[PDB]
Design a protein around this ligand. Structure first.
Ligand code: GPA
Ligand code: GPA
Ligand code: GPA
Ligand code: CO
Ligand code: CO
Ligand code: CO
Ligand code: CO
Ligand code: CO
Ligand code: CO
Lengths: 314, 314, 314
């Protein structure tokens, strides 16, 4: 596939610092090269230069609203640019708050997009329902059209325009959802597969249902927002808010291998990789390595193998 | 749900000491509080004061028959009391021999009860078939009506009255069964899902079948006897007789989440947690933490989330 | 079952030394005894004395062709001998290149054999498609009749005669396949279940399909070539070429428990156990222990339990 890489070293969506190093470590793991090593046409748009906003006091409980809203605004423009270039945007990021800009920018060029959100969390708290005030746990609330009237005017998000309906998104991996978030899930009728459903159906049926649900009516561009804490912390420990009982490495690759095969992936986010939270240098590489494997699968790397259009035996 | 907590610091059902500390560590992990943190009405009946029986020589091969039979006799009375109070009995115990008193006491108030036994073992050896002489591996034999004639009069169990039929129990997680125990399984036609069946069907079908098998004919109270060594030792290492290839954390929560949803749980045992067998302080917390998570799920904690009967967006 | 044990301390099929110690460590783990401990008739044919071939320069890129071809030639004769004795051959080996002799010798006595290859790799590279030159990654190419014309005359393999068709083999566990190997898979129409398929279908359906595919038409002897790197390295780390995202311990036992139940197993290989590659003494025992468990299951050891044809309650 044709890829448009976007580095988003941002962390203000949550407390822990180290997430802005995600692009750095992921690139240094040889992600660009390894992608090119496949049948991929890769163009790096570099790391977005997120200007420092020293003056950014809390909006009620919401922390760093201006810094977050600005970073997402910038990322949205860069993402829309890449799509206009006919490339799949690959956002190497910091915290998941960036999803607001990523999905917004993508929807400008492809308003008919469907979203698959792999995460241990729903990140659908509103500025009013959140108890942490961390914006990486509210991105989805800003994008949903149905919640357009329940979201206050938070400094930094004047540019935001809800671009998706509760029916154009599917969650996979949920295992830590706030009461307010669960209320929204049930109220808006959002389709989700928490770890309970994965256990019940198996990752195979979960993906069949997911794609069927999003592509049943008609084929449409797919945006995959992958939070690394969606996978079990035995695989991606270096992350801000880990939760045990997560998706396995295998299930992670299965999800992505399936998305790739649809031939409809046009947007991807690899989020929450925080190198500073690895208790050992090995937990860091284990997290980065896993994050790269997930990425490579999104672009064709298959476990059963891959081969060029030629006669290898001749 | 309405809960009746019963502490059973007993260990004489097996060799290793540390199991009598199960109640202590589980309560200190904040189990009562966390249960109350949910929509639970909790009443603690304290830790049963199991008097010391200095004179208790072996009955043939069976060890500490009087101490075990007495502890179970006491627990049975305390359990029957809690049920008469309209509460779900939660037995925080030491070794699994206590299951004899727990299930006996429960059946006095609800003779139509069905049992789900999550364990790496069948614990169905008779005083005559056992090779270890440890009573935590014989509880089921004392409760089965069909085996009423194959169980000798063991000092301390004169009060025992077989209260369940081979058809009112389902095993889940089996992976270490003695030849004599397997003979009983096949002879009495007991329904079981060893790790082989879990692998073949998936934990989802296993629970569908289990509940269908026990609640198909009619709805009836459910007694869940959960031995922590039923889960893989990578999750609950601090336990007396661990066996690799066990149920996963996820499968563990799935089982319990499903039991809860039946709305028929009225008896629960969380057994074999031995803090003294953790090779590290972390193996201890990992075991206790997992044991608490299992418990919380039995009373409503859902991975997809929970919310109060109110409008969170207002 | 009646077993014929064959030790094959060979390593020249790949770079790392320690694999020739496989027989040693496996026997010292009490494999013979434990097999006898079951309803097994065991006869040890000892460890094959593989003479040293000092003069063995590479054939193009292929390393140690004479040493490998000779060891396999010897093993083939020893294996054919054991089958003529009406025993199931159990090859405790070094590297997987020995599969060439094992399967060849087995097919001489049972030309209608079907093969199940559990491995992270397809080991189907030809001397011409291989990029490593390591023969433990080419065994299958030497045995397939369809590739008879694409295999050059490599010093040491004049005795070889392709003995199986692409349709008499099923792969399980694939997750690291070379482009040339994948081309062969798709071209010859070989049946396989990579980790992608295991994830999609579940190990239960995978085995149903495997056996159905190999025994559907008619019942025929089964040859199981089990490479320990087929299982996840968290279970068998002491091995030459480990790959993450492998089969679980449970899935490993499930596969073998199912093979056993067919009552058609007549050939078995337990390969790639390299004690020298364990980073700790525990990784070594974990690998050997797992390798023994796999073996025991092939000969009857069931997780649900086993019992003699007698009345245990009497
Ligand atoms: N994305 C996370 N980690 N969410 C946690 C919690 N639901 C919040 O909004 O802070
Ligand atoms: N419950 C256990 N660990 N049972 C082991 C063995 N079946 C016994 O009776 O001692
Ligand atoms: N069997 C292994 N490890 N194969 C690796 C690779 N396909 C080769 O031929 O060297
Ligand atoms: Co998350
Ligand atoms: Co997230
Ligand atoms: Co047990
Ligand atoms: Co038990
Ligand atoms: Co291999
Ligand atoms: Co191999």
């Amino acid at each position: 596939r044709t890829i448009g890489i976007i580095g988003a070293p941002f962390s203000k969506g949550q407390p822990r610092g180290g997430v802005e190093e995600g692009p750095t470590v992921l690139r240094k793991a040889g992600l660009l090269e390894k992608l090119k090593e496949q049948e991929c046409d890769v163009k790096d748009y570099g790391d977005l230069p997120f200007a420092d906003i020293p003056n950014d006091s809390p909006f009620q409980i919401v922390k760093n609203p201006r810094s977050v809203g600005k970073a997402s605004e910038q990322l949205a423009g860069k993402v829309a640019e890449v799509k206009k270039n006919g490339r799949i945007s690959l956002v190497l990021g910091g915290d998941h708050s960036l999803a607001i800009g990523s999905i917004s920018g993508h929807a400008r060029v492809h308003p008919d997009l469907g979203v698959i959100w792999v995460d241990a969390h729903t990140d659908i708290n509103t500025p009013l329902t959140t108890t942490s005030g961390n914006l990486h746990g509210q991105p989805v609330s800003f994008l949903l059209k149905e919640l357009k009237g329940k979201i206050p005017d938070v400094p930094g998000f004047s540019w935001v325009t809800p671009c998706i309906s509760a029916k154009d998104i599917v969650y996979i991996g949920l295992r830590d959802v706030d009461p307010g978030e669960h209320y929204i899930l049930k109220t808006l009728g959002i389709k989700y597969f928490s770890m309970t459903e994965v256990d019940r159906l198996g990752i195979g049926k979960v993906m069949e249902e997911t794609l069927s649900y999003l592509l049943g009516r008609k084929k449409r561009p797919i945006h995959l927002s992958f939070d690394v804490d969606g996978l079990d912390p035995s695989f991606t420990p270096a992350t801000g808010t880990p939760v045990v009982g997560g998706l396995t490495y295998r299930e992670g690759l299965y999800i992505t291998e399936e998305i790739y095969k649809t031939g409809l992936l046009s947007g991807l986010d690899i989020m929450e990789v925080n190198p500073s939270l690895g208790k050992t240098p090995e937990e860091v590489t284990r997290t980065v390595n896993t994050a790269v494997a997930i990425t490579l699968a999104c672009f064709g790397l298959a476990r059963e193998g891959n081969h060029k259009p030629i006669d290898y035996l001749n």
